Design a protein around this nucleic acid. Structure first.
Ligand SMILES: [Mg+2]
Ligand SMILES: [Mg+2]
Ligand SMILES: [Mg+2]
Ligand SMILES: [Mg+2]
Ligand SMILES: [Mg+2]
Ligand SMILES: [Mg+2]
Ligand SMILES: [Mg+2]
Ligand SMILES: [Mg+2]
Ligand SMILES: [Mg+2]
Ligand SMILES: [Mg+2]
Ligand SMILES: [Mg+2]
Ligand SMILES: [Mg+2]
Ligand SMILES: [Mg+2]
Ligand SMILES: [Mg+2]
Ligand SMILES: [Mg+2]
Ligand SMILES: [Mg+2]
Ligand SMILES: [Mg+2]
Ligand SMILES: [Mg+2]
Ligand SMILES: [Mg+2]
Ligand SMILES: [Mg+2]
Ligand SMILES: [Mg+2]
Ligand SMILES: [Mg+2]
Ligand SMILES: [Mg+2]
Ligand SMILES: [Mg+2]
Lengths: 210, 102, 147
RNA sequence: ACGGACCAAGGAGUCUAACACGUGCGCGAGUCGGGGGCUACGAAAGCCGCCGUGGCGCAAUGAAGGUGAAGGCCGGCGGCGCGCCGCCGGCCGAGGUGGGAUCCCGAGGCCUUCCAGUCCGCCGAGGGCGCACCACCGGCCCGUCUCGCCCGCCGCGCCGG
RNA sequence: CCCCGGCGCGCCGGGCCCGGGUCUUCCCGGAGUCGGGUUGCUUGGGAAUGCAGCCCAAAGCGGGUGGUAAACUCCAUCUAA
RNA sequence: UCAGUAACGGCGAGUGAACAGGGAAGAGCCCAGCGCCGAAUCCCCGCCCCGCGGCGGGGCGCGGGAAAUGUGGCGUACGGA
């Protein structure tokens, strides 16, 4: 029996909800447990970063988000082939690799190849045997100075380029933005209809000539 | 007249150049290999044809293409698979006609 | 605070604030939204109009990401860019108009609602309004489209 | 008419979610770390801002494709029959009427021996800017209906305004 | 003061004779399965989301998906049994 | 968080996700097929050495079986030989 004025409402409590009530009193204990597991992993891998391997500069799908840049699953095989790193060497030297990704854009391809070139320079590779170093190993001065990096290694920042104040030209003054938008809407709506009418008019012209 | 990159229209989207890379190797599944064609025509020679396929061959011999398409569509389901089976039966009917002629 | 609630003052009173003639029974008029067409017709007519029935097309798999188009007005267009840009645009004698990137600020469409100060702009947005274009061209400025 | 021998103890509008209204506090076109991470009581507390992602609010409307919230005046030119429409340069540039708490101006006077006579207050005829709010008249955006005239081209059209 | 496990060092017995780039020549896929009709249950899934019973029953530049059933046409994206 | 939203429902009562974004965590792979290698493979029993309270490693057996109706190595959609 509703009273004078109020919102219509649909409470979803018609099931037996009191059996399945997830209480959240485990929350600070789980924060302590995640903290101890993370410190245990950081003490387990002693020179390696506590976060993990590096993750790609990634454009977002689904037009709400495509201006933003994320950290992705892993590097692409074409990215590794251009940078010159084998995909099984990359997992051993601490590089996220996934074979599912493609490379349609050239700019993001070059950006991830450049990020590989920066990470190969920033990487300090320790030798397998300390008594007998190999050809592709770091120097003894870098062996002592190498340490962990707290947080995400090379944190991806959404950079925006800075433009300067320009003088407005007569073509920019004479450009019609809303009219161009409406003409583009009309052409994208009527692209197939004009082509069908052109084919039908060509058929009428062939029927008139022949 | 300048043409700004528009989010809507016939050529919408942000202007990004496209590279020409090697296509994926998972895309070529179902490609007709010569050895698989040999195995396939081999077993077509050994086992023979199905009864509904023989009935559709008879419907193509009596020149009823629409009724043959309706029968193959009722037997196999979709119209695309029906048209492919009708073209395959017409091809093997032309092959049998050429073998009977010369 | 149970000492501030109403159950403290009603101790001693028999019907407990729920009436002596008509008792506080469990569900006298049904549960929830019971009888909105039959015996609660007047309440839903006077307070929830249009509640019953269907209208419009059934868009099956709707996408709020596709429906995403945030708007910003020309009245608070200068809140997106810092104030020293406005100072330098008012100070420059040559006429170097500042570029306001609306997609960088986080809006797609620019609508023209309020007064714009008399200095040229270069508004780079995804969509534009006709009134917004008229205000920008009347003040001075350009409307650059971007995808 | 029903319940009731008597006495002691227990005993009945609680809790969660959602919504509405009122009040208190903080910030304010912003607000919020609730999820995550870092540093006995302490499972607390403090911190994060390139962890404000995200919710709500700042823009509504249409079933949807979509669209999306003041104008006036001067000069020049083109068209049509001093008047109207369209295109460029400067100015005024955010509606009005009535009721409106408060504020502003001050015709005059506020007494000790008569006149002249400066400053601080104080009250007020009458006239104003008018807070909020109310009632109305206007104006703008959106869907729909009617009457007609013009503008634009990367694609002259069953185009767009 | 005992017991246990782990990080390392030194020795013995073994397995193993192991990579990358360029060019040429070959090869490459899971069948009463997919899918279609019908029925029953289920799902927010609505001309049938998923599963199951019966009947039909595949193909290889093929097949599945692209939230309205269908035909034509280009695309996008995966490789089921 | 999307979101009590799209959607389902005598469209009534009521029911009701998914994508994406921010995080905790993050790890990838192996066969059949297709093919190359004298079955190059596996199990059990006899003897010797070590160790034997998770019955394991090596050598010696014209010892017994499994397996060509296919065991092992290279190799699996990220191509492979
Ligand atoms: Mg009541
Ligand atoms: Mg993490
Ligand atoms: Mg009383
Ligand atoms: Mg009572
Ligand atoms: Mg009461
Ligand atoms: Mg009475
Ligand atoms: Mg009552
Ligand atoms: Mg009640
Ligand atoms: Mg009735
Ligand atoms: Mg009696
Ligand atoms: Mg009684
Ligand atoms: Mg009695
Ligand atoms: Mg008592
Ligand atoms: Mg109420
Ligand atoms: Mg309140
Ligand atoms: Mg059942
Ligand atoms: Mg059901
Ligand atoms: Mg299609
Ligand atoms: Mg919400
Ligand atoms: Mg009804
Ligand atoms: Mg249910
Ligand atoms: Mg997600
Ligand atoms: Mg084999
Ligand atoms: Mg796979």
């Amino acid at each position: 029996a509703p009273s004078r004025n109020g919102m219509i409402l649909k409470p979803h409590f018609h099931k037996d909800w009191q059996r399945r009530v997830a209480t959240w009193f485990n929350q600070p204990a789980r924060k302590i447990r995640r903290r101890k597991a993370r410190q245990a992993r950081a003490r387990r891998i002693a020179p390696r970063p506590a976060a993990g391997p590096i993750r790609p500069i990634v454009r977002c799908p689904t037009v709400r988000y495509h201006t933003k840049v994320r950290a992705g699953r892993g590097f692409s095989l074409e990215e590794l082939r251009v940078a010159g790193i084998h995909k099984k060497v990359a997992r051993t030297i601490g590089i996220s690799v996934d074979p599912r990704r493609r490379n349609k854009s050239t700019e993001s391809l070059q950006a991830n190849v450049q990020r590989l070139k920066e990470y190969r320079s920033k990487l300090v590779l320790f030798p397998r045997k300390p008594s007998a170093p190999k050809k592709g190993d770091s120097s003894a001065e870098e062996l002592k100075l190498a340490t962990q990096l707290t947080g995400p290694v090379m944190p991806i920042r959404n950079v925006f380029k800075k433009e300067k104040a320009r003088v407005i030209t007569e073509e920019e003054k004479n450009f019609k933005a809303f009219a161009s938008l409406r003409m583009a809407r009309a052409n994208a709506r009527l692209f197939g209809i004009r082509a069908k009418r052109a084919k039908e008019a060509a058929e009428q012209d062939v029927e008139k000539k022949k | 007249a300048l043409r700004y990159p528009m989010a809507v229209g016939l050529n919408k989207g942000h202007k990004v150049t496209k590279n020409v890379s090697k296509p994926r190797h998972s895309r070529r599944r179902g490609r007709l290999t010569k050895h698989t064609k040999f195995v396939r025509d081999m077993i077509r020679e050994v086992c023979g044809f199905a009864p509904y396929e023989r009935r559709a061959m008879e419907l193509l011999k009596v020149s009823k293409d629409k009724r043959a398409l309706k029968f193959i569509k009722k037997r196999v389901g979709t119209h695309i698979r029906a048209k492919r089976k009708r073209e395959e039966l017409s091809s093997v009917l032309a092959a049998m006609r050429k073998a009977a002629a010369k | 605070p149970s000492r501030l609630r109403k159950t403290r003052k009603l101790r001693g009173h028999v019907s407990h604030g729920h009436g002596r003639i008509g008792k506080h029974r469990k569900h006298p008029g049904g549960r929830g939204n019971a009888g909105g067409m039959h015996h609660h017709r007047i309440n839903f007519d006077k307070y929830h109009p249009g509640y019953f029935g269907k209208v419009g097309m059934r868009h099956y798999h709707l996408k709020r990401n596709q429906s995403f188009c945030p708007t910003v007005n020309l009245d608070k267009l200068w809140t997106l860019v810092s104030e020293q840009t406005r100072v330098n645009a008012a100070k420059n004698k040559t006429g170097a108009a500042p570029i306001i990137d609306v997609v960088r600020s986080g809006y797609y469409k620019v609508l023209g609602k309020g007064k714009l100060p008399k200095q040229p702009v270069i508004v780079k947005a995804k969509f534009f309004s006709r009134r917004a274009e008229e205000k920008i061209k009347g003040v001075g400025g350009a409307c650059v489209l971007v995808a």
